[PDB]
Design a protein around this nucleic acid. Structure first.
Ligand SMILES: [Mg+2]
Ligand SMILES: [Mg+2]
Ligand SMILES: [Mg+2]
Length: 533
DNA sequence: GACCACGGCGCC
DNA sequence: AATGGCGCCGTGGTC
């Protein structure tokens, strides 16, 4: 429909582009086009044409920006219809879906993608007419965040490859020791990576008791939860659990990651997906750097591989109990607020009449369990305690936090009536199953509905913090590298590391004052692990 | 080679 | 913390 016109397009044009593969740091830019004023302009030479653009404006704008940055061009992402649609309804996660829903078709041609971006923007922008709070999120959070994310993705993080290569060889030997032992105990070799073959050995051959079933197909489960309950029923179980941890870590982190170092940067580059979750959280992929191990000994060895550039240091910042602090704000519960106001540690309170680092991490679990409606039975089982004691603290927990219960009840009722729930800033998630006539389904929905305002507000705060923090770091010559939901990892020159850490901490803590203070813990170090002071 | 569903599990 | 939110592994299957 659009009149074909020579490259370049006029300022403000919407861009379309085709990548050889989804990851922009690795993609070949196959085609580039732009649409505006009833015309479409197709670039004869996509790479060179990139220099003609003032900004990347259109579907998946950030992806193009990342590729431009990769090529040394400071091309910032602007409007992206995906972000508008994601704010309207976070189930809007793909261009295929968004195009279908809001006025077009996602094809494989740059020109059509440019045209599509233009008309989708017009339509979506119109749908936002009147949605003042979603507009504010778009302008103050999502749109500027996309530029920040573009820089993070293009910067990447340094990884000690030789170290991981050496580690792989060690872990391989330990795994061989484990599988050889398991096979002896089974009385025959099988594929130990097959949970189906494992199922038969444990429950049919060795005749161990099958405890639970798998969700979709009803097989006898061999999950860690089950194996843990059998650890003293046969010596093969512990060996299997150790085999699981080692192969999990080797196959997911140790072996793959070193092979993903980019030839130009010498660094590892993730993608931070901005329209991928139902709550407003970011996600990370290709590879996921938001689930790097940290809990077990080997897991910590893996995390140590993430290092600062020579002459620089990593600065790691974490919000402390951001979700509970958020819950205190949203519910307005006086006591829970008094808890954070008076700089006390809540999990401690409960831990005493329940200081050990285990008698606390057990008090945290319970606190969150009752929070999510865990009954006196369902919780007394999961945790080594009688049903009585379960129902016991359940009643008091809410006796002392009455407004938390009332907030949950109010949130669900409104969710049922409106069809959606919302964060502090008005980000929405639609949850229709709050009215289902099947209890298990309805109650699953209720746990999602109630979680979203809390997890989503925490996400809103972190995103806003990232938006505020980025320009300050640029001025100081520091970089933002990673976000892990309630954590940030920065890279700073050694001489400036301490100042950067102080500043970033203050920016994060004061991003948007609540009824309770936000607290941030900060560490500095040569690697991701050591940086967690 | 690709895709899928699944069970399973890494992080927040 | 993992109840909630994700992404990736190998297996088993298909195309
Ligand atoms: Mg933490
Ligand atoms: Mg799954
Ligand atoms: Mg296969």
């Amino acid at each position: 429909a659009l009149e074909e016109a020579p490259w370049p397009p006029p300022e403000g044009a919407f861009v379309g582009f085709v990548l050889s593969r989804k990851e922009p740091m690795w993609a070949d830019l196959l085609a580039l086009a732009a649409a505006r004023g009833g015309r479409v302009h197709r670039a004869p030479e996509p790479y060179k044409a990139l220099r003609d653009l003032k900004e990347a404006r259109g579907l998946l704008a950030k992806d193009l920006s990342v590729l431009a940055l990769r090529e040394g061009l400071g091309l910032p992402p602007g409007d992206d219809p995906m972000l508008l649609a994601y704010l309207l309804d976070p189930s809007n996660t793909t261009p295929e879906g968004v195009a279908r829903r809001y006025g077009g078709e996602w094809t494989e041609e740059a020109g059509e993608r440019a045209a599509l971006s233009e008309r989708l923007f017009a339509n979506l922008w119109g749908r936002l007419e009147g949605e003042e709070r979603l507009l504010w999120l778009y302008r103050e959070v999502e749109r500027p965040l996309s530029a920040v994310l573009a820089h993070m993705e293009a910067t990447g993080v340094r990884l000690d490859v030789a170290y991981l290569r050496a580690l792989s060889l060690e872990v391989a030997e330990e795994i061989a020791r484990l599988e050889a032992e398991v096979f002896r105990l089974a009385g025959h070799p099988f594929n130990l990576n097959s949970r189906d073959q494992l199922e038969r050995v444990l429950f049919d051959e060795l005749g161990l008791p099958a405890i639970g079933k798998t969700e979709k197909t009803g097989k006898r489960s061999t999950s860690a939860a089950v194996l843990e309950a059998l650890r003293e029923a046969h010596p093969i179980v512990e060996k299997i659990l150790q085999y699981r941890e080692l192969t999990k870590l080797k196959s997911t982190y140790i072996d793959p990651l070193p092979d993903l170092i980019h030839p130009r940067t010498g660094r590892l580059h993730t993608r931070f997906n901005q329209t991928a979750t139902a709550t407003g959280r970011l996600s990370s992929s290709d590879p996921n750097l938001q689930n790097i191990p940290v809990r077990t000994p080997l897991g910590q060895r893996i995390r140590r591989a993430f290092i600062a550039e020579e002459g620089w240091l990593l600065v790691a910042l974490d919000y402390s109990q951001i979700e509970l602090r958020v819950l205190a704000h949203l519910s307005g519960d006086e006591n829970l607020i008094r808890v954070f106001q008076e700089g006390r540690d809540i999990h401690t309170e409960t831990a005493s009449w329940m200081v050990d680092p285990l008698m606390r991490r057990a008090a945290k679990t319970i606190n969150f369990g009752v929070l999510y409606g865990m009954s006196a039975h369902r919780l007394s089982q999961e945790l080594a305690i009688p049903y009585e004691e379960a129902q016991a603290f359940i009643e008091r927990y809410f006796q002392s936090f009455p407004k938390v219960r009332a907030w949950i009840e109010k949130t669900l009722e409104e969710g049922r009536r409106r069809g959606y729930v919302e964060t502090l800033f008005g980000r929405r998630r639609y949850v229709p199953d709050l009215e289902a006539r099947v209890k298990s389904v309805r109650e699953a929905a209720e746990r999602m509905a109630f979680n979203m305002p809390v997890q989503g507000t925490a996400a809103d705060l972190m995103k806003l913090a990232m938006v505020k923090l980025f320009p300050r770091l640029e001025e100081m010559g520091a970089r933002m590298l990673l976000q892990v939901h309630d954590e940030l990892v920065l890279e700073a020159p050694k001489e400036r590391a301490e100042a950067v850490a102080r500043l970033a901490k203050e920016v994060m803590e004061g991003v948007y004052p609540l009824a309770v203070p936000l607290e941030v813990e900060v560490g500095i170090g040569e690697d991701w692990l050591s940086a967690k002071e």
